[PDB]
Amino acid sequence: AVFYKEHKLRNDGLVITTNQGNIRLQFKSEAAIEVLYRADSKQLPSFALAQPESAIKAQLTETENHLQFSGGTLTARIQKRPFAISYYRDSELLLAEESGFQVKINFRFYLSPGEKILGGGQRILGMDRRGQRFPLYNRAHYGYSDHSGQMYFGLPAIMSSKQYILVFDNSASGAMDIGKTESDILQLEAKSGRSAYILVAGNSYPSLIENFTQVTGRQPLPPRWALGSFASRFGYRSEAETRATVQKYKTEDFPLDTIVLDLYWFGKDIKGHMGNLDWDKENFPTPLDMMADFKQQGVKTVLITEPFVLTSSKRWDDAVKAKALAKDPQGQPKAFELYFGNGGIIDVFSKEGSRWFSSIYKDLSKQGVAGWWGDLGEPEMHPEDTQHAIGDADTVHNAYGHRWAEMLYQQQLDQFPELRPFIMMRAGFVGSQRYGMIPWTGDVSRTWGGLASQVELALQMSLLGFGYIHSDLGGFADGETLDKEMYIRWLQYGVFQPVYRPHGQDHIPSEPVFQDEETKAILRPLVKLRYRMLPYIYTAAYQNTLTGMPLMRPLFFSDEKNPALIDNKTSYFWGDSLLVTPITQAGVESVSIPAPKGVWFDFWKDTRYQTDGAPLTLPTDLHTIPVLVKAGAFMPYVPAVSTTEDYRSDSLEIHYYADASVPLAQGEIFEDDGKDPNSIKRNQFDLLTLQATHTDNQLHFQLARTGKGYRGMPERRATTLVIHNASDQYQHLDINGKTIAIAQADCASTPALACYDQERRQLQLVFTWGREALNLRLHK
Amino acid sequence: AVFYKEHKLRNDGLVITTNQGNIRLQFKSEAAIEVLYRADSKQLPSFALAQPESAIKAQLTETENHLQFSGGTLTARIQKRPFAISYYRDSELLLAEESGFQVKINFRFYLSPGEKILGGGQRILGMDRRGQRFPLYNRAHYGYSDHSGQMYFGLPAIMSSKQYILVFDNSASGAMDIGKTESDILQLEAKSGRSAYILVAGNSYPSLIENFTQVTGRQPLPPRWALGSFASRFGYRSEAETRATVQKYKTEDFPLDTIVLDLYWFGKDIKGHMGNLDWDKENFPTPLDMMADFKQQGVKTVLITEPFVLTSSKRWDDAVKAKALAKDPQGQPKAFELYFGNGGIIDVFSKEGSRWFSSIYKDLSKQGVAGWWGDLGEPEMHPEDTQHAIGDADTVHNAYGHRWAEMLYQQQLDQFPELRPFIMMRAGFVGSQRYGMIPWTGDVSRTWGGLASQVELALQMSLLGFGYIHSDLGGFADGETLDKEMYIRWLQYGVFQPVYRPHGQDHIPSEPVFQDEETKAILRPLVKLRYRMLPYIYTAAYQNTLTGMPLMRPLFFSDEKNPALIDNKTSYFWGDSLLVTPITQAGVESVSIPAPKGVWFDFWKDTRYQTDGAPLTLPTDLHTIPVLVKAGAFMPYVPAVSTTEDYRSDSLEIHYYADASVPLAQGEIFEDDGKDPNSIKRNQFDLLTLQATHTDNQLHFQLARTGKGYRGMPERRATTLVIHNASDQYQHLDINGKTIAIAQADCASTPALACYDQERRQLQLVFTWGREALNLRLHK
Ligand SMILES: O=C([O-])C(=O)[O-]
Ligand SMILES: O=C([O-])C(=O)[O-]
C-alpha cells in the first residue's frame, strides 16, 4: 500500500513524499521527464542522460485526488490514493504505472490493448517484443543465427506504437517482462542500481527520436572515412600480411580507407597476451613505418583493445602497481579465468584505471593509430564479486562499455581536438552514441539466418540512438568453406547499411579482394558505388547528428497510422529515398516488396512502378539486391575515389526521379572538410539545396548553397542533372532566365547543355553550380 | 671539272680550296662531320646542329692523291683529282660523293647496290624510299589516306641500311631524288639557302640514333602529363561546352589530363578571326576561372595558335605598328589570301616579330594556359615574295616551324624555369626535338587507309629524332558518320603510340567519352591501361631524352643483318618489350605476326609462343589488338588514376615473363616528380633496377635503386611481382637470405607472401621494396 503524503516544488523539480519515501520528478526537456524513486538515498547517477542535472521550468497544479506536473508537451498525472503516476501527451494517455515502484528494484506499468512494443536493444525475437521476457545483462552470443533473447548490447529501453520511449535508467543486472507473465503488465527489474525511469514523448516517430536524442545525447558526426571501405579479418598475423592486404586492395582496384588489426597485433597467440597493449615486434617489426606508409596511401590503421589484462601479460605488474584493475572485496586485484587466460579487468570507473588506460591509448595514437576498436565490453566475463570504484560488477555491468567509450572519447578529443574520434564497440548503454560509439552486432554465424537477422538488429538499435549499428559483413563465426552466395548477398546489403566492414575468422577470407573472379566482378562496382554515393550517405549522417534520425529507417515510418507495419523486418529505408529489401535466403528468384502507396523506380533498371497499396513483385539477380527509389528523390553522386582522403565534389552528378504525383520535392547535400569535429557548430560547411516544382506544364529546379564554407570547398561545381521519367513534351529550358534549346538526339555523344534521350525518358542538364542561386525551368 | 688546289688545317676545321671555291670540314663529334661548300661566302647558318660552332680535334693525313680527315670513328676521304669526298666508318665505305656539289644548289652521291634508304620525314611511299623522288617543301596534305609524296613535316635527311644518317642542312624549297632518275645516284637540290651536309655514323641503329641526337639535339623530357589522356576536337565552341566535356570524362570514368581548345577560343567563326590571339568573351566569358577550375580537377588547358594575323583581326594594326609581320620587297607588311582571310605572317626570324609573339604567349600563360599548340607552321601558305629578316619565304620555308618552336620554347623556359614546356606542332626541321617539339601527322582522313599509314609515318619521324610523333586518334578529316570499327582500332593502337590524343572535326565526336556503350566498354579499360602503364612509357621517354631511342622502334631493330625487315610497316616495338601489330582493315579475323626468333607471350591471354623464325598466327577480337611480350620482359604498373597530377608509385605491380631461353634479363623504372625540367641533370630521380638470373635450378631477382630521389618519393613501395611461365618446381624462396615457404593454393584468396598458381603458371611474390638492395631467390 502506497499513498501520497506531501510534496515540495523546488527547483525546478517536484519532490513527492509518500508513506514509503521520496520521489523526485524533473523535466529534462518539454517532452521528457526523469522519475527518481528512493530520491532520499544515495544511488548511482544517471547514465542515460546527457545533462543529468537539467530541470526545465514546469507547471504544477493540484486537485483533491491528483497532482499535475506539466511541461510543454508531456504531462505527469499523479494520483494520490493509491499512489500512481501516469503520463500524457496532449490529452492522450501514453503510459500508466500499475504498482509502479516496488522495494531488488521493480517497476510495473500497464500496457494498453493493441499497444506494440519495440525495444530491448539487440534481440532476435521479432520487431514487436510484447509477449517476451528477457534479461538486461549484456552478454556474448557467439555464433548466433536466427534467435536470441540476450546478446552483446541490450538497451533498458522501449519504443511504443503510442509514440513514447521509456528508459530504465539503471545499469545493473536486471530484466524486462513486456506483457509476457501478465498480458497487460510491463515489468522492469534490477538486482541493484539506480531506481529511476525516463519517459520521452513525441508527435511522430522522427520527433520522438529527436526528443530522445536531445536528452540522451546526439552522435557527433563521425569522420567521413568511417563511411568508406574497411579491410578486416580475425586477424592479420603480421605487418607483412597487413601491408600485403592494403596492397591487394590497390592491385584489385577496390576502394580502401581503413585496415583493422585484431589481437595478433599484440601477441602471436589468441590466448595469453591480452593486456600487452603494445606491438608484438616479432610479427609487427616496424609499426610506425607501417602506419605512415598506409597514411601515404590514404589508409587509416585501427587497433583492437579489450578490458582485460592477463596475469601472463607484460602489463600485469604495472596495472597492479597503478591500482588500475578492479578489486575483490579484500582489496586485491581480482583475477578470473577468461577464455584467454587468468586476468583482471581495467576499472574504467576509477580515476586510477582511467588514467592508466587513457595513457596507453594516447601513446599508441601518437605513434599513428587513427581509430579504436574496443571488444568484449559487456564485459564478456564479469564475476559478481568484482568491485569497481562505484559498485560491484552486477551493479555497474551494463554501463561498463558506456564509461569505457566516454573515457576513450574524452581521451581522443583531448589529444586531437581537431579530429573526430572513431570508436567501435560491442556493448554500451542508452546514450553511448554521445561518445561516438559505433556498435556492431558481435560474432554472428556464417549462415543465412545470421544475415536474415541483421535488419531487425540494426533497426532496433537505430530507433534507440545508434545510427552506425552494422554487422561483420559476410558473416564471422565458424564455417569451414565460404558460402559464396551468402557472402555476396551480405556484402551487397552492406552497401546500404551504416558501416562497410566485412570481417570474419581468417580460415575463410572476409575481405572482398580475396574472393573469386565472379565475386569480385559483382562486388567491385558496388563497393565503388558506396563511394560514389558518399554525398547521399554523409548527408544522412549529418541529419543523424542534427536530429538523431537513423540512417536505416523502418518501413513503419512510411505510415504511422498502420501499426501492422511495425512487424516488418525485411525491407527498410536507407536514407529518405531508397527502399531496400536484402535477399536473405539462397536461390530466391523474386521478391514481394511492400512498397508504400506511391510511385517507385527500380534503382538498377530505371523501371517505373506505381502502386495504391498492393506490394510490388520484382525478379532477383545475383549481381544486385532489390532497391526502389521514391519518386521525388534527388540522388547525388561524385566520382569514385580509392580513399575518402581523395574525396572531391568538383564534379557532381544528381539524379532526380520525376513524377507528376510529386508536385514538390526537396533534396540537400552536406559538404564539409570531412574531418572537423566543429564544422556543424561553427557553420564551416557548404549545404547544397535542391527544390523541384512539378506542375502540368513546367518542371523547375531551384538550387542554392548556405554555410560559411570550408578550406578547399569548390567555388564552382560542374553539375550533371539527370531527370528520370522526364516528359517528352518539354520544348525549352531557361537557366536564370536565359532560354536554351533542348536537343532531342545524341545526348550521350555530344557535349550538350540540355538533351532529352527518348529511349530512356531521361533529360540531362549540364551546367556550372556556383555560389549564387540557380533556377532551371523546363516548359512544355 | 673540279680539283683540289690547297688546304689549311685550323682550327680545328679543314679548309680546302678547289678551283671552284672553299669547303670547310668540321667534326661535330667523333661520329659526325659537317661539310660546308661555298665556305667563303655568307650563307644562312646551320639549323640542324645543336652546337653549330663545335669542332672537335681530328687528325689530318696527306698522300699524293688524297687527304684524310679522321675523327674517332668517322673518316672523310678526300680524293684530289677529280675532287670527291667519301666517308668511312672503320674501313667501311659509307657514302661517296659522285659529282658532289654543283653551282641553285645540288649535291650528288653514289648509292650502293642493295643499299636501302629510309628518310624524307613524312611520306607514305614505303619504308625504303629508294626509287622515289620528292620535294623538300613542307606542305599540307589535307585528308590524306594511303599515299603521299609531300606532307606537313618533311625532313631533309635519310637513314641508310649502311647505318649512316645524311642531313641536307638547308632550309629552302628543294628536292630529294633517291636513285629515281639515276639508279645509282642520290641527288639533293635546293633553290637557295645553305650549301652544307652533315654525315653521322654509328655501329648499330641505336648508336647511330644516339650519335645523331648528340649533334642535332636531344628532346628534353616532356612533362609526365603529356603521356596522359587528352580531350580534343575541332572544336569546343564555348566555355560551357569545354567544361561539359571535362565533366563528361568525370562522369563516364575516363582518365583525363588535358583539354585542348581549337580556334573557336579566339573567334566564333573559322574564318576572319585568326590573329586575335585572345579569348572570344562572347563564348568563353570567364576563361581564368575556367582554367583554374580545370586545374582543381588536375586538368591542363592547351590553346591553338597559328603564324597568321588576318587584316580583319583585332591585332592587325598593332602587329603592323610593332613591325611584327613579314614584309614585301617594298617594305610593307605582306598580306595574302589564306583560307581564313587576307592576312600576313608573323616573322619569327625577326627580333620584332619574336618579341611581339612571345609577349602574347607570356600573357596567356600567366592567365593559366599550361601548354601550347602551334598549327599551320609549314607555313601552310607562304608566297615566294614574302620577306623575312634573314631571307625570302622560299629560302627559310622549311625552318619556319623550327624557329617558331625555338621562340616558344625559350619563352616558356624564361617564364616558368621549373616546368617542362609542352609544344605541339605540325612542321619543323632536323633538330626541332631539342625545342621539345611534339609533332602530329596532320589532317588525316577518317579512313582505314589513314590509320594504316600511321606506323610508317611514326617510324619515319621517330628514326630521325621525333619520339613523340603521333596521330589524331580516330581520324580527323571529313566523314559523315562515325566508322565505329575504324575508330575503335585507332584508339586501341593509340594506347601503344606516343601521345594519346583523339581529335577530329566536330560533326563526328572524337573523344571516347562521347561514344556508344560498346565502344566505351572496350576503350575505358584501355585508356586506364595507358595510365597503369605510365612507369613503362615514362621510362621509355627517359631513355629517349638520354639517347634519342624512339618510343616506337621498327621491326628491323630486331635483326640488323636482315635488311629485308626494313620494309615492315605493320608491326613495331613499343618500348623494349612489346611487339604491337595494329589492325588496319575492317573485319580482320586473324593476323600473321613476324615475331623475331625467340619466346613470346600473348599480352592479353598469357599464352606462350616459341618460334625459330616462322611468323605467329593469332586470332583477332574487337576488344584488343595483337600485342606480344618478349620473354625476359619486366612490365611495371601502378594503379590507374584519373589524372597524372594524382600519380603515385607507393604501390607497384611488376610482371616478369620468365623463360629458360633468357638466362639474364634487366628492367628499369624511372621515377621523378613528373615536372622538373632539371631532374635528370641534377639526379633528382629514383631509378629502380631489376635483374633476373634464370638457371636450370634457380631464378633470382636483384632489386636496387639509385639517384638522389625527389620531394614526395616513397621510401618504401608495396610491390607485387608476378612471374609468368614460372616453373612448378620451385620449393623455396629466400629474401635477402631469409627462407620463406611458397604456398601452392589459394593465391588469389589469401594475403600470401609467396604463392604459385598452378592453373595460370604464375608465381606471385608480395613484399616491401625499400631503399636498400633486395635479393629474391627461388630454388628448386
Ligand atoms: O509529366 C508529364 O506531363 C509527362 O510525362 O508528359
Ligand atoms: O624453368 C623450368 O625449369 C621449368 O619450367 O620447370
mmCIF file of C-alpha atoms in Angstrom, chain A residues 233 241 243-245 247-248 250-251 289 293 296-297 509 513-514 639 650-653 714 716 718-720 747-751 764 766 768, chain B residues 233 241 243-245 247-248 250-251 289 293 296-297 509 513-514 639 650-653 714 716 718-720 747-751 764 766 768:
data_model
loop_
_atom_site.group_PDB
_atom_site.id
_atom_site.type_symbol
_atom_site.label_atom_id
_atom_site.label_comp_id
_atom_site.label_asym_id
_atom_site.label_seq_id
_atom_site.Cartn_x
_atom_site.Cartn_y
_atom_site.Cartn_z
ATOM 1 C CA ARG A 233 39.653 -10.135 -40.547
ATOM 2 C CA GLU A 241 50.341 -9.672 -44.127
ATOM 3 C CA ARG A 243 50.814 -4.495 -45.908
ATOM 4 C CA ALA A 244 50.011 -7.262 -48.426
ATOM 5 C CA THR A 245 46.287 -6.757 -47.799
ATOM 6 C CA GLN A 247 48.401 -3.797 -51.498
ATOM 7 C CA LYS A 248 45.735 -6.300 -52.614
ATOM 8 C CA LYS A 250 45.342 -1.422 -54.675
ATOM 9 C CA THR A 251 46.083 -4.152 -57.203
ATOM 10 C CA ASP A 289 56.683 2.968 -40.657
ATOM 11 C CA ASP A 293 53.205 4.123 -45.279
ATOM 12 C CA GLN A 296 50.712 7.958 -47.605
ATOM 13 C CA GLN A 297 48.144 5.834 -49.474
ATOM 14 C CA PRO A 509 38.675 -14.731 -46.224
ATOM 15 C CA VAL A 513 39.643 -8.583 -52.643
ATOM 16 C CA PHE A 514 40.399 -12.191 -51.682
ATOM 17 C CA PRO A 639 33.198 10.156 -58.993
ATOM 18 C CA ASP A 650 34.189 19.462 -58.030
ATOM 19 C CA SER A 651 32.079 17.150 -60.218
ATOM 20 C CA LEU A 652 28.515 16.366 -59.132
ATOM 21 C CA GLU A 653 26.046 14.046 -60.799
ATOM 22 C CA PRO A 714 34.954 24.298 -54.639
ATOM 23 C CA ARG A 716 32.001 26.173 -58.809
ATOM 24 C CA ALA A 718 30.363 21.023 -62.763
ATOM 25 C CA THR A 719 26.920 19.504 -62.363
ATOM 26 C CA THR A 720 25.083 16.918 -64.460
ATOM 27 C CA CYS A 747 22.618 13.073 -75.807
ATOM 28 C CA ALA A 748 25.403 10.648 -74.898
ATOM 29 C CA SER A 749 27.545 11.609 -77.911
ATOM 30 C CA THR A 750 27.703 15.439 -77.744
ATOM 31 C CA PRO A 751 28.716 17.993 -75.068
ATOM 32 C CA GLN A 764 20.103 15.621 -68.941
ATOM 33 C CA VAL A 766 24.858 20.015 -67.658
ATOM 34 C CA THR A 768 28.020 25.149 -63.561
ATOM 35 C CA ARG B 233 38.104 18.115 -81.135
ATOM 36 C CA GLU B 241 30.973 23.061 -73.926
ATOM 37 C CA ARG B 243 33.501 22.444 -69.085
ATOM 38 C CA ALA B 244 30.821 19.916 -70.120
ATOM 39 C CA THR B 245 33.480 17.792 -71.833
ATOM 40 C CA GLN B 247 32.672 16.817 -66.802
ATOM 41 C CA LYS B 248 31.840 14.003 -69.253
ATOM 42 C CA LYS B 250 34.494 12.564 -64.886
ATOM 43 C CA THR B 251 31.002 11.110 -65.164
ATOM 44 C CA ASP B 289 38.006 30.752 -63.756
ATOM 45 C CA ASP B 293 38.526 25.099 -62.152
ATOM 46 C CA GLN B 296 41.461 21.938 -59.373
ATOM 47 C CA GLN B 297 40.489 18.680 -61.115
ATOM 48 C CA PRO B 509 32.760 13.100 -81.906
ATOM 49 C CA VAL B 513 33.523 9.584 -73.721
ATOM 50 C CA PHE B 514 31.044 10.573 -76.439
ATOM 51 C CA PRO B 639 47.122 1.722 -60.074
ATOM 52 C CA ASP B 650 53.542 3.679 -53.480
ATOM 53 C CA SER B 651 52.040 0.502 -54.975
ATOM 54 C CA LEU B 652 53.927 -1.264 -57.772
ATOM 55 C CA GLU B 653 52.859 -4.321 -59.712
ATOM 56 C CA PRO B 714 58.097 6.932 -51.445
ATOM 57 C CA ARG B 716 59.047 2.013 -49.317
ATOM 58 C CA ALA B 718 54.480 -2.270 -51.691
ATOM 59 C CA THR B 719 55.467 -4.486 -54.597
ATOM 60 C CA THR B 720 53.670 -7.424 -56.206
ATOM 61 C CA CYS B 747 46.995 -17.472 -54.180
ATOM 62 C CA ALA B 748 44.222 -15.029 -55.077
ATOM 63 C CA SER B 749 42.323 -15.620 -51.816
ATOM 64 C CA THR B 750 44.993 -15.152 -49.099
ATOM 65 C CA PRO B 751 47.484 -12.378 -48.201
ATOM 66 C CA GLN B 764 53.353 -14.178 -57.127
ATOM 67 C CA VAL B 766 54.456 -9.668 -52.436
ATOM 68 C CA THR B 768 58.256 -4.219 -49.433
#
